Amino acid sequence: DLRRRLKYFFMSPCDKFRAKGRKPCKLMLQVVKILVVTVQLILFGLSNQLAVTFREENTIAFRHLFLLGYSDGADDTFAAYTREQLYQAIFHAVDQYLALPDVSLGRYAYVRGGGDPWTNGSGLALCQRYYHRGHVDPANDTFDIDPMVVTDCIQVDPPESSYKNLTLKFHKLVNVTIHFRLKTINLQSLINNEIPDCYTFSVLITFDNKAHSGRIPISLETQAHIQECKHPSVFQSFRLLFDVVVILTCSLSFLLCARSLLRGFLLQNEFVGFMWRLWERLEFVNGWYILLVTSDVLTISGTIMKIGIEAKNLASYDVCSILLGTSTLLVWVGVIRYLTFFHNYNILIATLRVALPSVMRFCCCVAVIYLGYCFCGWIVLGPYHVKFRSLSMVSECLFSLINGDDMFVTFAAMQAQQGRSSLVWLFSQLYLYSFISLFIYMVLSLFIALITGAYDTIKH
Amino acid sequence: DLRRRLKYFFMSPCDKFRAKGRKPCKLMLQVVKILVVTVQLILFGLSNQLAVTFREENTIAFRHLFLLGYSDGADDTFAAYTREQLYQAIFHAVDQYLALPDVSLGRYAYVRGGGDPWTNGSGLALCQRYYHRGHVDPANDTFDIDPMVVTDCIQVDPPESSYKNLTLKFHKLVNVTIHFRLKTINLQSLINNEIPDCYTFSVLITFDNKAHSGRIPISLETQAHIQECKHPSVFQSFRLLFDVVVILTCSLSFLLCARSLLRGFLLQNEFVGFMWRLWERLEFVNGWYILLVTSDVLTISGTIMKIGIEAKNLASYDVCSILLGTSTLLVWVGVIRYLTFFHNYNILIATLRVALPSVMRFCCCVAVIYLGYCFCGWIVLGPYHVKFRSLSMVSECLFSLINGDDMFVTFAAMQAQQGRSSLVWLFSQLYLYSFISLFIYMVLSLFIALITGAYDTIKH
Amino acid sequence: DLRRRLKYFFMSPCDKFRAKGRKPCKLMLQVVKILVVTVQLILFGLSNQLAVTFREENTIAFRHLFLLGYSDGADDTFAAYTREQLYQAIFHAVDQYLALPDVSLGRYAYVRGGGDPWTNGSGLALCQRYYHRGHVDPANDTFDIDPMVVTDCIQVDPPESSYKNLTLKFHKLVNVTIHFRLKTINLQSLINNEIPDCYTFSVLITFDNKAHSGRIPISLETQAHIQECKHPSVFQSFRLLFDVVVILTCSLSFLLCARSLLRGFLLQNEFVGFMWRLWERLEFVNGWYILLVTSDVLTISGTIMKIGIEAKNLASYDVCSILLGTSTLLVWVGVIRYLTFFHNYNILIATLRVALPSVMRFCCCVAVIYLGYCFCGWIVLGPYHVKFRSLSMVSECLFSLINGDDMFVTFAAMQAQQGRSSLVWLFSQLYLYSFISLFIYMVLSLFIALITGAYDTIKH
Amino acid sequence: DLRRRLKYFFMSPCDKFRAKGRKPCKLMLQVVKILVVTVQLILFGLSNQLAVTFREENTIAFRHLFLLGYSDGADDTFAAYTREQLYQAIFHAVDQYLALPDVSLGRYAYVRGGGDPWTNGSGLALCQRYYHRGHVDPANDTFDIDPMVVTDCIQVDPPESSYKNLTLKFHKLVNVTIHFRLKTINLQSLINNEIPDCYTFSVLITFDNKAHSGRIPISLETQAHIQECKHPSVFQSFRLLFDVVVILTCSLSFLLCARSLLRGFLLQNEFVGFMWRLWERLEFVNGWYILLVTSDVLTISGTIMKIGIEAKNLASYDVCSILLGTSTLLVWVGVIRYLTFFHNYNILIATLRVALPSVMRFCCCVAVIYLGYCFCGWIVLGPYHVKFRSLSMVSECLFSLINGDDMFVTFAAMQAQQGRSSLVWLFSQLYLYSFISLFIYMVLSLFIALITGAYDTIKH
Ligand SMILES: CCCCCCCC(=O)OC[C@H](COP(=O)(O)O[C@@H]1[C@H](O)[C@H](OP(=O)(O)O)[C@@H](O)[C@H](OP(=O)(O)O)[C@H]1O)OC(=O)CCCCCCC
Ligand SMILES: CCCCCCCC(=O)OC[C@H](COP(=O)(O)O[C@@H]1[C@H](O)[C@H](OP(=O)(O)O)[C@@H](O)[C@H](OP(=O)(O)O)[C@H]1O)OC(=O)CCCCCCC
Ligand SMILES: CCCCCCCC(=O)OC[C@H](COP(=O)(O)O[C@@H]1[C@H](O)[C@H](OP(=O)(O)O)[C@@H](O)[C@H](OP(=O)(O)O)[C@H]1O)OC(=O)CCCCCCC
Ligand SMILES: CCCCCCCC(=O)OC[C@H](COP(=O)(O)O[C@@H]1[C@H](O)[C@H](OP(=O)(O)O)[C@@H](O)[C@H](OP(=O)(O)O)[C@H]1O)OC(=O)CCCCCCC
Ligand SMILES: CCCCCCCCCC
Ligand SMILES: CCCCCCCCCC
């Protein structure tokens, strides 16, 4: 009565087909889903690459146009050190903004007004921020500071020199910023056969004095707002149709998997009832179907967001990419289920499955030692070692060391400071050698031993 | 009747010699083949190195001569950013072309005419390509584009300034190219005792505006056409003879191996016929002889191509090198057969052979997870990480991570973008840590376990 | 009588609670200790990061202000090679010191007098050191040297050119130094909500001729003396209270652990006495409590030093950081004790414990081979290889090689010297290949085997 | 009669002492030998470091003084590309040579005459080498060359401009060289308390045109001839005594070890004779004593060479360093013998010993595959990949790949050439992926398996 039903429920697709001759719709549906999801992700990535490259190339051009004495690879060290240098950089940026139409290799339009920091009819805002009251007398070890920040900002209209009278309050200066906007048209879209779209680049140039260290870093950042151009004309819809096909495939997969999960739950309820006459009742849950339902939800939501983005109604590229990428990862991981139907592959998959619990437990054991080392290295070596400045950076360095990467440079950075502090150098020697020896000779060896033991258990 | 024949067929060379005292011609033939094939490959590579160096040195000299403000290591970032910069670069290249006889350290001759892009009597072609109709008004978010490309190209005759009147259509410009040819004689051939040959370098300088990003990259490429000089004269054939010797050795090896394979097939047919009174019948096939026949074919074809190339009748160096290198690899791999005749080496070789099937199956299992990670990383991190821009690049990065290479720089690239997008940085942390942990603690451990299990099976 | 007491003594916390229902104060005390110690370390590190950054940024600004022709990344090669270059560098540094008020982006005050090398009223000391008697005649292979060093030093008062008359004794010059001090106020302290403190930077510029090689390296170092500003005023104590809480928690932990250790010792004495009617009697010692007592002592001492430092009465940041970091590492390592109470985690921890003795013995065996290789590589390759200049550097290089890091660059450095000395290049080939092969194929394999054997022993 | 003698012969030092109470002179002699040999090596290395640094610093100073437009890190790319550049470089070098007394920071004396290439009274030789007859007409694809090299060389006397009339035969130029010598005194010897010695630097500047590629590399090399200064005088022998002590210790060790080996041989002869009433008779040979005798010979010879060198009668630093380093390596490896006397260490050492034969056999099996890959990669990728230019470089790259080092850069170098040749890029993908997969997943796994099997054999 019930034993036959339970036996059918826990049977492989091939033997299920032999038993009842039903159509294996779900399996071919999953194959088609993998295909279409991968194709959609590839097309989306190819489309996004072009936009990313356009933005990056424009920003590099802006750095070469507006930053005085800029060269590639200098982003992290580009700074001013004298009052003359700072004035020259600021005035050069403003003059290049005013000369852009006659000098630039790109074609840019000016944007006026549109809220702060710009007044009406103003294209460029040159704003200096300094403390409301600042009296600093290091000679007398004295200071009187009101930390309230005051902004004083000059407005420059593009053509068709009040900024040259700028006077900086160096002793109380917090920062200087230059804000402007440039409109351009992405013609290289025609390479991919699309229609050009209209970009507005919001450019911010920052001269940062918040450290008050005598060194003022200079940076240029851009933010791109993309719109559909309002008058396209190119001499002489199969992308939304594919998105709809993807949505329908994922919807059908979700419905079939949900029906299977519901049937499994009903059978579990029947079994518990008949056994009245949780690790065991959760044996009725097909984890692969949980994974498939999750991937279907992620794909549908990401495809809706993609439709929005490609129509220019949305600009949340990161979230859409994360959803689509995670769903593609899950659907490809789901291919392991088909390999589990064959004995030779199932041996290896079962080995991994039976090893996983002890691997996780050993990871928990190793984590406390690893975290102790992280904290110690951060506190002791952070003042001296560039790779130990932040806790996340320390963790990345230690993790790379565990895997035998970037070891000699880590030792050499401390070598460069051996003469300064001998105690810190000796401590670094002990710290690095002990950590590496412990984690390579003993920890990774035990991971290998756990996997080998699981494999030997499976093979018998 | 037949059992004796089958026993003789499946016997080692030494015991075969004991049984019938026949001459082991094939074994010494294989030894000689390995020797001569390796010698030929070494000579060919030594000869190709000189030509490669000559071409590379000439091209570096051209970059220093013709690119304004060029310096070594700037190939990937060399670009123009202003109209003045572009004009200066173009005019500098043309002026250096015209001044070459009096300034260059090399000796070059001019080439005139000879088809497009050059007219008759013209040495240098300066061509600008722009859209047929281009109206771009980013101010009004408007554009009218006919994507048909128009080429307008100026011709410069070498001496024995109409180009100075060039006017670039910056808004519709697709690219600018400079084409010319230089003839030189490779005298350093005398270092290797050969006869100098005549090179024609086709030089192409590209100013690329296809991105329309305000940044125009500049590159110089060369193509070398090598000929026999028509009037050699050096004050005061044992290379083709060696090629013929190689061809004959490989032909004899091919014939002997083919005869052995035919005999094996005949014996298999006899055995099946007698067993009437495919994994078993393919046991009659000597795989080492399949490999030897393949290597003989590859060596003969590559040697024919090499004879053609060295006479200057062919220029397909890549295919010839691939054929000869693959054949040399195969003949060296064939030395394992001789080690299989000794018990202690055969133990290890048999271990590898019995492990291989499960290793391939586990590779198949690991491949789907790896590919899912590839797709996810490409879509999510490609906009932010230089190592994740293309799918092949993503695969290379992930493969290097599996083996503990370039890990910290991968983490640091994302560190550099933590402030921008926190969600993407957190995702990258999860992505990298999970991938590395999974593939190093569990996957490589299982490869080790598979090999160890195979070894323990062999030793019992 | 006694067996019950001994059984209670060697019981887990849960079963102890069942037996006597006593309060598990020590366990929750240890949890609280871990929490507060970690919080204190994080706060201390965040506070120290700001000061480190302030000092580093000021020093970089000084290098750009005072070193003629300095650029970032040139610290290790910055040098003078002509007499004119050296004079220009010295005079540029002094002129920039005199012009600092009108050119610097920072706000600095001059410091006068205050002991050597400065006289009263002098801000900058320009001192040249040369041998008392030096006659060097390489033409006649002759020299007469009195190695006693003479110091002649010019004093410059800051404003509100006797140094321009400096004449260097080039042939007998030992070095040149420029000493001065600058007072500044650390305003960026307000970012962390603290009160700005007063920094005195002692700047030393060295032109070093001790090698007498014709190349004089130039360096700039700073030493920061931090004080409480004597007239703070910022428009509109929960850090010392936390330190006191930490001290009290660690004191209570120390007392409870000491009481437990004393009770264990008394029980051991009773057991030996009753067994009259050291590896066994030390079984009565709880090693986790030894570790906890050590961590308590380190935390208390480090917290006292931290209280001193934050009040500006102490400047021993290195020792305080080492104490606090080591204590945090120990308290996090102590979490393993709680995992040992659960069978599945205890299996892995016990595996590590039983493997440790043989791991240490094998480390001892490997150490002599490693040290022999260190000495050989230092003596043979040190003259030619940058990574082999010092013994500690050699050890770092070899250790990185063992773990598969920085291998190809090590080979390439010797490749760059193959033409010079063929014998040394061949020796380096043998040396590197043999070391790497031995230590990767055999040594690490044996570490894996030891751990696997221990794991198999534990699982049975 | 004999069994007692054989039993005594094969006994440990402790049990030997119990049996006969003889003095263990050899063991303490070996301890003293290790100590003194290590001390000698350390002192020798510290002494050599100073001389190496002096030579390197002088050579860097020469590069900055004599090479026009030279900067650090440009050694490998420093070249001339125009006739004007080459003339300027040559004339700048000669002018700096003539101005050296008034410009250099070092103190140098001129050397005149003394054989070729200098005439009597000449300090600098400026020599150009070109073909005897050279007619190159690339326009007509014609050339008439007599490869005999003619040298024409101008002589410059130092002061107390015929070279300015140099005319270069650019079309037939082989190279240009500048030779001169400078005498200096190594004053920094006083830092180590030694006596300054007199250096003669032979400086060679080469402008190399042997490629005839239009790019002429420029290099500067030095050769240092060190002498004892003939008139030392420093205001106000325990190194040779230590060398004699080392020689005597090694002589005594050699004699005792030779006596033991002779006794072993005599006992073996007795045993074979009595067994009449080679793997077994070589069991009578103590391999540790063979090693000790070798190390004694190497140490004595190296110490003799060191005595010669330090007296300035010899200049063979490389051979002496190799001898002393190898001997120190051997004496430190000999410490394993003492660990073999203890069971727990002997287990691990015996594991390594019993694994070694199969490890060597597997290395032999792996070598043919590795060499096939080396040849294939050299021939196919050498034209395109910098890491594959020479066979030794290919081997170093592949060995580094086996150990997971420098993998991503190897892939990226080929990425940079994907557009050029797609066939070569695909081949490189297959080549690299297959090599790395094979050698990491299967070969290293089998090394681990061999060691684990040996360990399990030893433990039972
Ligand atoms: C009255 C119906 C009410 C429910 C409505 C929804 C019905 C619906 O989704 O059925 C899914 C199946 C295929 O679903 P599919 O997954 O291909 O097949 C099922 C699975 O193999 C399942 O095993 P697991 O996958 O391991 O859980 C098994 O237990 C079911 O048998 P069982 O029923 O005897 O237990 C199968 O029917 O059938 C269609 O797909 C109908 C196509 C119709 C024509 C389409 C247009 C031409
Ligand atoms: C009538 C003949 C028609 C066929 C013509 C071609 C004949 C031809 O290739 O024979 C190859 C053998 C050597 O060939 P070689 O490979 O050295 O030797 C054979 C292999 O050992 C083979 O074993 P596998 O290699 O394991 O398959 C074995 O079965 C054969 O014995 P079997 O015949 O009893 O079965 C051997 O003869 O003999 C010559 O090489 C003759 C030299 C002649 C003189 C050369 C100039 C001085
Ligand atoms: C007359 C007393 C003289 C000694 C004075 C110091 C007394 C002192 O430290 O006791 C520690 C314990 C808790 O200490 P705590 O560590 O939580 O608990 C002890 C441990 O569990 C110990 O095992 P191990 O940790 O494995 O060694 C066990 O043997 C002891 O039982 P036993 O005594 O039967 O052998 C327990 O009492 O009790 C308080 O903490 C009192 C709180 C009082 C109220 C506080 C304010 C509200
Ligand atoms: C008539 C003698 C002719 C031969 C002359 C040379 C004699 C010479 O080298 O003896 C070495 C031994 C110490 O040598 P040493 O190595 O310390 O000791 C020997 C080893 O232990 C050897 O074992 P292995 O090392 O395993 O082979 C063992 O067989 C010998 O016993 P056996 O003789 O019963 O077989 C020992 O004598 O004795 C001195 O060192 C004498 C010191 C004298 C005083 C020095 C100044 C105060
Ligand atoms: C039948 C249930 C077994 C678990 C399948 C889900 C595995 C997901 C891997 C991420
Ligand atoms: C006797 C047949 C066994 C297989 C030999 C071929 C192996 C080729 C390795 C690439």
Distinct compounds present:
ligand EUJ, decane
The main sheet of chain A comes to:
7 strands, antiparallel
Kindly name the structural category of chain A. Answer: alpha+beta
Helix and strand run of chain A: HHHEHEEEEEEHHHHHHHH
- Beta content of chain A: 15-25%
Structural domain tally of chain A: 3
Compute the number of strand runs of chain A.
Answer: 7
PDB class: membrane protein
Keywords: Ion channel, membrane protein
Assembly: tetrameric
Entry title: TRPML1 in complex with compound 8
Compact summary:
The structure is a homotetramer of 460-residue chains. The first copy, chain A, contains twelve helices and seven strands.
Description:
In chain A, strands 1, 2, 3, 4, 5, 6 and 7 form a 7-stranded antiparallel sheet that branches. Chain A has 3 domains: 3-50 and 238-341, no CATH class; 67-228, no CATH class; 344-458, Orthogonal Bundle (Helix Hairpins). In chain A, helix 3 (25-66) crosses helix 5 and helix 3 (25-66) runs antiparallel to helix 7 (317-333). The longest helix of chain A is centred in the first third of the chain and has 42 residues, at 25-66. By secondary structure, chain A is α+β, with helices and mostly antiparallel strands. Chain A has 12 helices and 7 strands. The interface between A and B is large, with 93 and 79 residues. Residues 16, 20, 22-26, 255-256, 259-260 of chain D line the site of one ligand EUJ. One decane binds at residues 286-288, 291, 333 of chain B. The PDB classes it as membrane protein.
